[PDB]
């Protein structure tokens, strides 16, 4: 593990999906959200299907094999871990939550702009309108932006 | 590790009180919030009228003049300054938040527990049982207990 991805080609990986949504919708979401921070670094994000990706997306239950188990419907959302092999970059989102691709729910394109940002290595805003301030509120999908804090704080990591 | 208050007689006034539960039930609430501190440390909460309270509790919304801005319903619950002097203390709560009395919307009591360790000088823990610990999960109020964490926490400000 370290501060940031030693390389700028990062793999990503749907381990298995949320029975709460179509699964084209959760494909949407994920890729939407690679993409908020690739609009604004020279990161630049692959799905893959078959073998071993840097960023292994999972939504699991209660303790899930990382020691940081999940707690049920509401409180914990989802994690990630900062870059590095093997479990480094991998973002979990609790299953026990209902993911949604707007509101009435968990909003699961916001969740994982957030967590994808630890996944880069971006650590917690106290700018609560930052996507990284560390509590959910929904807003509106079709005009979500980065804030500027955010655009600063990932561009500080990856010149 | 401070600021702590340098003194272990502490006053309180609840300035206002929310209308999604009855008086007597935000009067309940915080009064019990305080005791659950005082069952652990030598601190003695006392509820005042007059102009000086250590700790003023007040329900707010949005931006409310101390460049805390609440952010409408969801995300942000409620904060509190740490011990000192003028508005030192207080706990200002989310007015665009449900408050209740038991298990939906946010519950006021859990709220105002955490919120009063930090009107007492806590700041946040990593252990999820704790109540210091940053993300809002409603437990049964009836079986409620600090953990230990919080109370080696509290202990090591107060004795
Ligand atoms: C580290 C993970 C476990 C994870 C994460 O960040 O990935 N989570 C974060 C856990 N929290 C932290 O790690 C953390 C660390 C340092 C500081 C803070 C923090 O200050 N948070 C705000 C705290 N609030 C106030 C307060 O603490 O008094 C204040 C400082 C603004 S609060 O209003 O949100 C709040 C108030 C009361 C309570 C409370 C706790 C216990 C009982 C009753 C009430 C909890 C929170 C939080 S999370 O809760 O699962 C999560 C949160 C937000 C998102 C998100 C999704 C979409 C878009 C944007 C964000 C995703 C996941
Ligand atoms: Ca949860
Ligand atoms: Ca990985
Ligand atoms: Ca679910
Ligand atoms: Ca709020
Ligand atoms: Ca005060
Ligand atoms: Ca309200
Ligand atoms: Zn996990
Ligand atoms: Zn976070
Ligand atoms: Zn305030
Ligand atoms: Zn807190």
Do not use: C
């Not at 939550?97 to 996944?119: C, D, K, P, R």
């Not at 804090?149 to 990932?154: E, L, P, Q, Y």
């Amino acid at each position: 593990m370290g501060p940031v991805w030693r390389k700028h080609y990062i793999t990503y990986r749907i381990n298995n999906y949320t029975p709460d949504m179509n699964r084209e919708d959760v494909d949407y979401a994920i890729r939407k959200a690679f993409q908020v921070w690739s609009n604004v670094t020279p990161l630049k994000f692959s799905k893959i299907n078959t073998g071993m990706a840097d960023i292994l997306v999972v939504f699991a239950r209660g303790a899930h094999g990382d020691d940081h188990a999940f707690d049920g419907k509401g409180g914990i959302l989802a994690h990630a871990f900062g870059p590095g092999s093997g479990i480094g970059g991998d973002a979990h989102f609790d299953e026990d939550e209902f993911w949604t691709t707007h509101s009435g729910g968990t909003n699961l394109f916001l969740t994982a702009v957030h967590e994808i940002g630890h996944s880069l290595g971006l650590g917690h805003s106290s700018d609560p309108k930052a996507v990284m301030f560390p509590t959910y509120k929904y807003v509106d999908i079709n005009t979500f932006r980065l804030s500027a804090d955010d655009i600063r704080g990932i561009q500080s990591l990856y010149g």
